[PDB]
Structure 1
């Protein structure tokens, strides 16, 4: 947190551009600058110093000078004062409400938690669950609780079929002491890039977890991706644990390494890595890495036997998960 004041300001700018301006490229610009600054091992003394980092340009450097000088940013002070902007920023904190819906609700005079509660009829299923657990979803998950959650998911999955393999990814795999949610990567030998030998592979796991009352709500669900809600069991006489977000992704077994690279993140790391891939003449998704032809069209999937193979193709030294928290 050497430069926490600066990274916080940039993150707030990023969110404004995403949520209010709907300017996704500016959102990404601010996030990139925040990330490069967060990893910079010196306390920043000037905008000039910051501008030497990639992703920090003239405008952000000027903002950093203002912030260092006064401890604030006039641009943000004004944004905080603005009713429409503040309302839109708030509503987007509900899962399922993005920039477009938030502005639509604000138009219709729905702009507070109270307003949402009285207008449940205007929400879709995802938004209604997001509102229901608004408080809980803002809380972080102590790694101690992530470990208990891991034990439950891994054991319940084993009970369904011993051939499943469940891997907890995201911030947890990066070694974080707390996580925003739980991300589970699932494989089964019956599901590969070549064939699907059993139907309902994801379904059966989701069903078992609902049966033991671990999964409590569903935000969205398909053949390969589940997004929903879960909760640890609590003991006699004790307060219940908060409800938590859970994501489950079923990946073809022979594409596990690309899948775990993707699902481990961070999100900014993934964007950085994929961009570099392109520069090197490859394209990366959660399934494969493929060479780009002279025309720029993706060729056939390259052989991958480890996460490190992917790094090797794009000529990056291997980075352990704990070093991917960008």
Structure 2
């Protein structure tokens, strides 16, 4: 339980503003401190203990000691007027901060403005068409139906395939922003070929409505369950050889903050961690537990990675 909601509320505001403004790493820094605040065992009540928490130095320790002494944050009044429109535009999938600054400085202010005068990549037109659906999280039971759809379409090509939905679904959340389905085969062999066929099969059945990125082993697209009343949902499908299954599981389960900290830890031990492998030369990792072992870390259930 967050004992410091008194301030994290105020700070996610600034964090989000820097984010849509394209100050990636300022926002990163703030996000990292917020997470420390959420998890610190008690409410913080002094400047000595501010800087105590890793992730808070001078500039951050202040705003905590300002909100505590003042009940407010001065910089929140000095937040650019454009920020809400920047957030609107970068909530379009395929449009980032640089694209949203452009459309802003071209004079656009509304989504109708974008549908009218703005030039859009294919992905951004899909993103804008599904704007509202894509900001809506799905119950995890809908995610299950999406996983099962992919799993059954795949298992008809080969029954031995492992298919696992990752993300916050795997971390136990009651709602999910999107679905990532990870596929492998234990025989180390049969994962080859079926990616093309499976996407067709799913396209042929009307399950896939829109393609966003067609990679060789990784697909990003849009799906919708059968029948009426349903929303388009972001779906990724990833096919991996069996020896990469553990690192793939760990990466696509996340969370993203958890992935960043693990990569950092791996770096401080002469290693690097990707969705593919734990490396120096690839260190074999048959299960997620082994990745944890090598980094000198206690295993952590998916629900415990929900950083």
TM-score, with structure 2 as normaliser? 0.91
Q: Which residue of 2 aligns with 1:217?
A: 210
Q: SS of the counterpart of 2:42?
A: coil
C-alpha distance in 1, partners of 2:209/2:304? 33
Q: Which residue of 1 aligns with 2:29?
A: 29
Cα 1:61–1:104, aligned 2, differ >3 Å: closer, same or farther?
same
TM-score, with structure 1 as normaliser? 0.86
Q: Which residue of 2 aligns with 1:113?
A: 111
Aligned counterpart in structure 1 of residue 263 of structure 2, from 258, 270, 274 = 274
Q: CA deviation at 1:87?
A: 2.1
C-alpha distance in 1, partners of 2:287/2:67? 44
Q: Which residue of 1 aligns with 2:302?
A: 321
C-alpha distance in 2, partners of 1:211/1:71? 57
Matched, 1:67 2:48: no
Q: Verify the 8 A CA contact 1:141 1:179 in the aligned structure 2.
A: yes
Matched, 1:152 2:132: no
Q: Deviations over 1:157-204 (max 9, x none)?
A: 212322332111011111111111111112246876xxx9844x3222
Q: Verify the 8 A CA contact 1:139 1:180 in the aligned structure 2.
A: yes
Q: Verify the 8 A CA contact 1:190 1:198 in the aligned structure 2.
A: no
Cα 1:311–1:15, aligned 2, differ >3 Å: closer, same or farther?
same
Matched, 1:305 2:286: yes
Q: Verify the 8 A CA contact 1:233 1:240 in the aligned structure 2.
A: no
Q: Which residue of 1 aligns with 2:51?
A: 51
Cα 1:75–1:178, aligned 2, differ >3 Å: closer, same or farther?
same
Residues 72-83 of structure 1: pairs in structure 2 closer than 5 A: 72-79=72-79, 82-83=80-81
C-alpha distance in 1, partners of 2:38/2:141? 26
Task: Give the root-mean-square deviation of aligned CA atoms.
Answer: 2.2
Q: Which residue of 2 aligns with 1:11?
A: 12
| Count, aligned residues | 306
Cα 1:152–1:198, aligned 2, differ >3 Å: closer, same or farther?
closer
In structure 1, stretches of 5+ residues that fail to align are 292-299
Q: Deviations over 1:21-67 (max 9, x none)?
A: x3322121111111222223434445554432111222222112333
Deviates more, 1:144-153 or 1:272-281: 144-153
Matched, 1:254 2:243: yes
In structure 2, stretches of 5+ residues that fail to align are none
Q: Which residue of 2 aligns with 1:230?
A: 223
Matched, 1:142 2:142: no
Q: Which residue of 2 aligns with 1:295?
A: none
Aligned counterpart in structure 2 of residue 93 of structure 1, from 75, 91, 94 = 91
Cα 1:47–1:135, aligned 2, differ >3 Å: closer, same or farther?
farther
Q: Which residue of 2 aligns with 1:297?
A: none
C-alpha distance in 2, partners of 1:282/1:77? 43
Q: Deviations over 1:73-96 (max 9, x none)?
A: 2312331xx333332232111111
Matched, 1:170 2:151: no
Q: Which residue of 2 aligns with 1:243?
A: 232
Cα 1:16–1:163, aligned 2, differ >3 Å: closer, same or farther?
same
